[PDB]
Design a protein around this ligand. Structure first.
Ligand SMILES: O=C(O)c1cc(C(=O)O)c2c(n1)C(=O)C(=O)c1cc(C(=O)O)[nH]c1-2
Ligand SMILES: O=C(O)c1cc(C(=O)O)c2c(n1)C(=O)C(=O)c1cc(C(=O)O)[nH]c1-2
Ligand SMILES: [Ca+2]
Ligand SMILES: [Ca+2]
Lengths: 600, 83, 600, 83
């Protein structure tokens, strides 16, 4: 959508997940910088009325901030002129059974916005856990349409944030732990009429491939690999769901995203490279046809679901030429960079030397050289594999500083013990088939279950780490960088931190009500620069805390790794907003005060 | 199985030492009931079907209705009127 | 307790509900005052991880802050040296059936603290909705003992905060809407052994009266009134439960508290004065024997439960006689002042001229001249009664400024339509018997349903209202006054405000995550004065929002009166602390950061 | 009924115009079931009962136990041992 890129040029709004189509979570504003970040204070706050994981970030368009929530996923609209008033709220009615088939908490990653045209005013889009995608008028919040995308009767839910391109709203999918075959779908923003749908496994007509799919890199694989890499009909239940993020290049009209892990976790029950799970996609937006696809993890064996953030940038080649790129910090521990117009493999570095499932990735063949000593297989218990299923990087939406040309990566430092087991597939039931035991990586404190995270500034071309810092817990919510030389992010233990982008020094922080798992956002209102972030620990890291568990292997093996978390935070939910000296529309006490008049 | 010996472009899987090249018949045979493997596809079919009715009704009426049961002329076995 | 009156002398501690036995919610500190107040910013915050109404206020004792919460009532302890750490938490296992017999949300008003002695260490006391009273080691949070005080099987729950005097802890009672006969019980802080117990109705022996009960004021009534002001055995389910607050004068060794309303609400079903419900009590802390008692509302007809706050002061009569006083702003819309040693009725004014159930309170007889046009009775729908069942004043624990000699009162402006009906009493089932329609008083906007609160500075002796200010919502959570000339209080629409104690002007306010129903508090730590408060709307005014009610008569009639509350706030739960420029232990970014290994 | 006409000190209730002086035997007689009106007292008795053993056991053992069923010497129909 052209108007959306136009609206993104104004520091006034944050119209989509990663702020703009390049998904960089970067702001050109310098009001808040290294010099004055010490004076950053809370301007106002808002509780969502619901607990559980609060992922994603709010959207700002003019004098309005849009807030999504975890189950029952009610959407709120706040008046920025006086954040105290709630313009509107759309609260749906869902079958609480949907909560039953959610693998990793009832989270939701965000909303989407369509600029509207001369026929239909601006619309806000939301996805619901129960499988529905819905459109609502942005002014009043009243529902325009609703369509069914995923059936919870088969363990198919929705947690991903909808994404708008031109006149299409994209809807991903969740449920690989339930054996759901992954698929992305495009609906018309106005009618909600399905324009196309593309699966991650099976025949090439369901895979939706362009006549010249993977032509620039034939070795990546091309035709009929959707069936050929699976034994029998196993692909009908082979995951591949995309619940991560998107990116889009309007110039070549290609949006990018990653397909998830194959089902079940038991690798012995599914021989083959299981394509096209664990792949990076380059799909034509209007038609949905794939121009290229690169499988990062052939025949997965660790649940390295490849749905992570896709950050776009234009940097200089290692041979000295300007290349249009795509950087992607994967769950398997590798940070991939490709020519986003080719699928050309340019960089594939380990985010931490401790990654041991792979010795290295060959840039000429693109194949990862597995280290047999760390794979998984029936009748065997692999140990100290890194990364763990939670990966060295999860759902967190990171950022890129176009000026310093570095990526601010929120990393996880977790490894695991893994032993699979046989199990039948019953639609609607779980189809995992593996027992885990997770804990801190070699650089952490496995003795005390601490030191499970890291944040680093990475250079895609040189593959060098400008600076690295250890965090007590995994930095799960992503990051945001600004022209002010600051890199914001939040922690699971309750803080929003601001670091020096050049040195990685901690310049400021605040103790929010609860841990964070969403990414920071920034907008400008009434000539003032605000920084907002959501809080409310949850997601996979918090299932133990959230669902009061004690078995260390419970929560797909996450409960153990995070048993200490509860000593630093409890559940929560809301959005906290900051500014210099806590300046807000309420600095003048009277603003908002009751005056007999009419409805406030 | 190091992942570098490919039977063809994009196909590099090999069974680990001692493990079957085919699970069918082995002791790791999943034996997936076909009835089960079909639930998903069937589901998408019925949802897409209901969506067509939803789309059709808002276009003809002018107002939106989610519950197909309340859509004037809704027939579970047929597709909306070709208009 | 003596050392308790001592710790109270140090501005670093807030050891009990109203800080000290005089229960004035007054601060001697001036760091924050009429000047700097505008530079007050959030220093840190904590999420309780639970929802629903958050009443009461946190207790601080040295380097620790204790926090109580609504059901499941789990207790927390924070390390003030670095608030991000949770020293300990005690989470009980209660029968969820308790929620079932709670009339007005599953709230809890506070904790109690016992300084400990050479035998046993300091103790933290809590009450649970399921009727248990429990002691815990204030250093580890380990349970010492738990006793059964209330039975939920008969509709008897606990919401009131425990109270410590000498080596005893007082436990109140809740359940009048379920026909529960009220009674206060005292236990040994160490053994948890029951010392005494006094009921509010029935025979003098169970009432526990002193040999000279009311000798000073015989006209108040004396012997056998708890049996003669009732027909037959009606008193066996009369109510009079005390769930408000206490006050204590160790000089005369007497504590004070107000007894609740009589059951049912259908007045016609219980003819008689209904003593001793709706009374002010003066009992010996060691025996529990009453020295005096005054019934403010004989034969209740409006649910003006007389359990409100008891603020002790030492002022001068109108005859120039220095008297140890007690001011009490009751639900009936009258604020009373008696001699806390004698029982003499010094003052009894109308908190607002709209009160119409009474003409006036004759100071000589001590009787409320009723106005038959505003009473209730079977087969009659009374209209426009003020105050409403919620009263012109509720559970909010207010404050008194010794120096300015005034009382900062948080008032409600709600009237109502009332209609009784016959119904059987069934142990464990609701026993109300009345349909109500509440709405804004005459001084508010009844069309738009706004303007239901007021904040006024009241002088007891002169009976004057220094200043008055109107709020759009009932100021429901009490107030706090400081030596700096400031009076803090929070609103239901989610703000914590500070007004000029002399002019009542609004000098500052902050938009908290959710509305407030508890009172603010302050303490000095690390040489810095902090102002903490709890947010999380709920309680009676919020039952409609918390439980999703739409019928205007639902919520005992509160739903219709607060139908607009939902446009200003959602649920929440936590505590937020403030200070000048929000300085805090974390002002040094590196404090509490991950510092593994042996640094030094 | 203005509340001033007191039958005696501390007792000033008077039937409102057109209402009985005694509800028993009137169209307003609540007719409470005594069996029901006594449940509260019975409940307090059992709790105090159980609580007695909780206080005793902790003194005699130095440890505290809530579940009376786990106290040595407990008996529903009997008070604690004089010690
Ligand atoms: O198989 C799937 O489709 C799927 C879905 C989701 C989801 O929608 O939350 C997660 C996962 N897998 C997953 O493997 C995982 O690690 C995970 C973490 C989270 C989270 O929000 O913290 N969601 C998910
Ligand atoms: O008579 C009782 O025992 C009883 C108990 C309580 C309670 O437990 O808080 C309330 C009430 N009554 C009551 O009438 C009322 O107005 C009320 C308001 C609230 C609140 O916390 O906002 N609780 C209660
Ligand atoms: Ca997964
Ligand atoms: Ca009551």
């Amino acid at each position: 959508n052209d108007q959306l890129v136009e609206l993104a040029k104004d520091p006034a709004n944050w119209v989509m997940t990663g702020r703009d189509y390049n998904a960089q979570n970067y702001s050109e504003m310098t009001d808040i910088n290294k010099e004055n970040v010490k004076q950053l204070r809370p301007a106002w706050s808002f509780s969502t009325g619901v607990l559980h994981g609060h992922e994603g970030t709010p959207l700002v368009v003019g004098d309005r901030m849009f807030i999504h929530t975890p189950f029952p996923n009610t959407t709120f609209a706040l008046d920025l002129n006086e954040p105290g008033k709630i313009l509107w709220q759309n609260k749906p009615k869902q079958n609480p059974t949907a909560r039953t088939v959610a693998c990793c908490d009832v989270v939701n990653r965000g909303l989407a916005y369509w600029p509207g045209d001369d026929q239909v005013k601006p619309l806000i889009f939301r996805t619901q856990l129960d499988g529905h995608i819905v459109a609502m008028d942005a002014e009043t919040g009243e529902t325009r349409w609703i369509m069914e995308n995923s059936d919870i009767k088969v363990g198919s839910t929705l947690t991903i944030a909808p994404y708008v391109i031109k006149d299409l709203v994209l809807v991903g999918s969740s449920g690989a732990e339930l054996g759901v075959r992954g698929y992305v779908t495009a609906y018309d923003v106005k009618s909600g009429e399905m324009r196309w749908r593309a699966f991650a496994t099976g025949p090439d007509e369901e895979l939706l491939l362009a006549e010249d799919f993977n032509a620039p890199n034939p070795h990546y694989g091309q035709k009929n690999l959707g069936l050929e890499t699976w034994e029998g009909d196993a692909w009908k239940i082979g995951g591949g769901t995309n619940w991560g993020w998107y990116a889009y290049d309007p110039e070549v009209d290609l949006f990018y995203y990653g397909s998830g892990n194959p089902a079940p976790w038991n690798e012995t029950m599914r021989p083959g490279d299981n394509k096209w799970t664990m792949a990076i996609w380059g799909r034509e937006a209007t038609t949905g046809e794939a121009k290229f696809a690169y499988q990062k993890t052939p025949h997965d064996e660790w649940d390295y679901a490849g749905v992570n953030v896709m950050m776009l940038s234009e940097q200089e080649d290692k041979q000295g030429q300007m290349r249009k790129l795509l950087t992607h910090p994967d769950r398997n521990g590798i940070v991939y960079t490709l020519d986003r117009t080719n699928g050309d493999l340019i960089s594939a570095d380990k985010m931490d030397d401790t990654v041991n499932w792979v010795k290295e990735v060959q840039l000429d063949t693109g194949l990862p050289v597995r280290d047999p000593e760390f794979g998984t297989r029936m009748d065997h218990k692999a140990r100290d594999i890194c990364p763990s299923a939670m990966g060295y990087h999860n759902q967190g939406h990171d950022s890129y500083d176009p000026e310093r040309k570095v990526f601010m990566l929120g990393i996880n430092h977790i490894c695991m013990d893994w032993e699979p087991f046989m199990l039948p597939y019953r639609a609607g039931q779980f189809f995992v088939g593996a027992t885990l035991t997770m804990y801190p990586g070699p650089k952490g404190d496995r003795g005390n279950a601490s030191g499970l995270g890291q944040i680093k500034a990475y250079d895609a071309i040189s593959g060098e780490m400008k600076w690295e810092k250890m965090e007590r817990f995994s930095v799960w919510g992503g990051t945001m960088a600004t022209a002010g030389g600051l890199t914001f992010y939040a922690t699971l233990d309750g803080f929003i931190k601001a670091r020096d982008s050049d040195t990685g020094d901690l310049l400021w922080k605040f103790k929010l009500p609860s841990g964070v798992i969403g990414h920071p956002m920034t907008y400008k209102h009434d000539g003032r620069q605000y920084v907002a972030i959501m809080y409310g620990v949850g997601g996979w890291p918090g299932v133990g805390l959230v669902f009061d568990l004690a078995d260390p292997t419970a929560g797909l093996g996450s409960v153990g790794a995070f048993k200490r978390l509860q000593e630093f935070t409890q559940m929560g939910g809301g959005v906290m907003v900051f500014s210099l000296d806590g300046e807000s529309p309420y600095s003048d006490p009277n603003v908002g005060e009751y005056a007999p008049g009419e409805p406030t | 199985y190091d992942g570098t010996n490919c039977k063809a472009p994009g196909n590099c899987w090999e069974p680990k030492p001692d493990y079957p090249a085919k699970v069918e018949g082995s002791k790791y045979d999943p034996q997936h009931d076909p009835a089960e493997l079909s639930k998903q596809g069937e589901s998408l079919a019925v949802m897409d079907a209901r969506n067509e009715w939803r789309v059709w009704n808002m276009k003809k009426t002018g107002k939106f209705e989610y519950d197909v049961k309340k859509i004037d002329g809704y027939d579970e076995t047929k597709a909306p009127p070709a208009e």
